[model samples]
Target: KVFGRCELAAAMKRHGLDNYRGYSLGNWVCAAKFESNFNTQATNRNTDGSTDYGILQINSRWWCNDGRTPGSRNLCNIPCSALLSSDITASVNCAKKIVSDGNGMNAWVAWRNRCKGTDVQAWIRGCRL
Candidate 1:
């Protein structure tokens, strides 16, 4: 799914992403914009051989198990494919775990470079969330 900014923001909020771990919902929204452009099926192969999967780009190196990442932790206890589902519930859950696992919102390099310490709220401007 290619979600609009407001649309994804509302969904993230519904899934309890608002102000999660001292990060505002806009942080996630902005991260997703840079990570996958709100596309559910987005995937990227890491130079290290792992893959980034889905909108929030949950990684196969540690967050998910694709059985080909060499040494996967699968901390989310889900197949990497789950992050590609259009429903986005699994992706959101995995993202939550990633943020909770001591990385905060800095888990995604996109977020750290693009959204961190900026006015990410602009990403969700005019949203009725």
Candidate 2:
């Protein structure tokens, strides 16, 4: 469950997310850091009565279904628990769908509020991709 930044970068690249959907690897990496500190099992309950799941912090209201939240669209068509796995393939796939939906990393408030325009090179610095 412990991954260095380089390791995470490699994993994301292998998942075809390095620049998937026209977003940079830095964008994905930085968002992951703020969303869940790269912990796949991380989850947060939002004040709007929704839960965010996994490293991407995908919301239950629009994406994955946690079953605890009502009126969830489950647009990703996967269980929220699927995103909580240490293997992040499912999470990355779901995130790709989100980005392709035209939201990009903006779907994550953390990315918009913190990562955008900031120096994101540190997320992949010294990593030989």
Candidate 3:
């Protein structure tokens, strides 16, 4: 719902994310693809009874509050539902705070598994940035 690959890359470029906090745009794009396939409305129920929210698949375990979810720290201070919207500014902002916490992209399991040590340039290939 947010954007396709090329549009996503252009948006990231406009946000000055060609390289953010030393992380490549490819990493961001790849993570997003694996997390939610560019759909902002995406949500997945985790086995622990918590849920992942939006394109970043941010977890209720620490990021946002969904009333039905327990033990959330709500570090972003936004409702979980906000992340499910088409607007990505908040989700991007929250992701920045997360990456700034010294975890880099390791905060996302998708990045760790799908992006790390992999040839991720294809994620941004042919994208007009």
Best by lDDT: 1
lDDT of 3 by residue, 1-129 (tens): 767988887776666666788888888888899888888899999887789999899988788899777666889888989888786777887888788885888999988988888887888898766
Task: State the TM-score for model 1.
Answer: 0.96
lDDT of 3 at 44: 97
- Candidate 1 residue lDDT tens string, 1-129: 899999999999999999988888889899999999999899999888899999998899998999999877899999998899888899999888888867798789999998899999999899888
What lDDT is reached at residue 38 by model 2? Answer: 82
Ranking by lDDT: 1, 2, 3
Stretch of 10 with least lDDT, candidate 1:
94-103
RMSD, one per candidate, in order: 0.9, 1.2, 1.4
Tens digits of per-residue lDDT for model 2, 1-129: 745678888889899997787778888899988888888888899877799988889999999887888677999999998988888899999998998976677888999988999988788989988
Against the true structure, what is each candidate's TM-score? 0.96, 0.93, 0.92
| Model 2 quality (TM-score) | 0.93
Backbone collision tally, model 2: 0
- How many pairs of residues collide in model 3? 1
